[PDB]
């Protein structure tokens, strides 16, 4: 499982 780019919201 690689990372996830940070979304525009949480």
């Amino acid at each position, epitope marked *: 499982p*690689g990372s*996830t*780019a*940070p*979304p*525009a*919201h949480g």
Partner: antibody
Amino acid sequence: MEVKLLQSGGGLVQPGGSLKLSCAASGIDFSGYWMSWVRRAPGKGLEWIGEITPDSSTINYAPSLKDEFIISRDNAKNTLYLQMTKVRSDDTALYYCVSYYEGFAYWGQGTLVTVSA
Amino acid sequence: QAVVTQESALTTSPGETVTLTCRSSTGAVTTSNYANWVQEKPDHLFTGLIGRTNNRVPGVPARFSGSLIGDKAALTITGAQTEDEAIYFCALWYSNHFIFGSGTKVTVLK
């Protein structure tokens, strides 16, 4: 590597028809990115259509538009899709796919959709 | 049925500070609204400036900063440049969807 979201699809469509828009990502690991669809209509501003998580577990829509659009993706093809159904005049606009990096970070060149009989 | 409101227009001279506000019809704007700021220059060139209230998109200049002022979201452009003349849209997060505001036309007098 230079990033590019190449959009294809769109054009003139009759009221009530359906369209599918494609957004092929280049230069990023499309698999680990939140993707989103927004649109820009002449008299309106930006309007957020929706978003999808890298695994497609979650797909969020604008409540007013959720019964008209379907967002999907194929990470093997590095592509994001927006399906429009039963379109109307207010759907005439430039549609953009956006990649989230803390914000609306990466944008495609835009696809014009004109809905008119 | 949430409306995000902004200033119609703002005028500044190069080198002065511009402050854009972003208001929610529901109530106060919080960090749970993850205010996003997007810039549109002529010929529909869209650029992401801010996301999650305060977070800059990497590489965006530090002269753009996102904050909360009172019960609103705010984008401040310190030392606005002729390059920064654009329409600035804010988007507020409402649990499961983004609503964009009607945008503010920022003029940098040339």
